[PDB]
Amino acid sequence: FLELVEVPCNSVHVQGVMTPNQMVKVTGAGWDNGVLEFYVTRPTKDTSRSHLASIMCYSKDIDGVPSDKAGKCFLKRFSGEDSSEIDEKEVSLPIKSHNDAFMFVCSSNDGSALQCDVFALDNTNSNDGWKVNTVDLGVSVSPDLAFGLTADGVKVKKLYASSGLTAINDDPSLGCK
């Protein structure tokens, strides 16, 4: 959307702060097993990182997932001061299954709040089209935010950021290649 450039790495690490209206995009075709986690981390303030926010999606198509979790997604917020968990909350997102294709598109409208558009193509009925819901992550932009996925076997993971965003593209520890 607009001028998105692929980030040749495994996650999107922003240099500095996100100005308003730039975007980062994380896409995949699904995952193999377990929970899908979309993360936003920030630098801890020795040079380590801490979660700022997390979206965890439980597949409706894996036997044994609790009935109160299966096919649901949850937003976990963390304190931007002591890295403490503030709260968890169910959020309405179109990702229902680990066989769905999906995209996360995150931006800050005013340089302060972070929100993401979450797109999914439901595998269990891929004959409907794409669906999208927007989620406010309920945290504020900090310098040097990182965005990515943590999951067992994400299929065809690709990453993009706005042209005007400074994204790390040469750190071998981020799988940059």
Residue numbers in the entry: 48 to 92, 96 to 227
From the article:
Thus, experimental phasing with a selenium derivative was used instead. The crystal and previous NMR structure showed that M2AP has a galectin-like fold comprising 13 antiparallel strands. Notable differences include the Trp-180 bearing loop region that moves slightly toward the TSR6, consistent with previous literature identifying Trp-180 and its nearby hydrophobic patch as the key region for binding with MIC213.
Microneme protein 2 (MIC2) and MIC2-associated protein (M2AP) play crucial roles in the gliding motility and host cell invasion of Toxoplasma gondii. MIC2 contains a von Willebrand factor type A (VWA) domain and six tandem thrombospondin type 1 repeat (TSR) domains in its ectodomain. In this study, we report crystal structures of M2AP alone and in complex with TSR6.
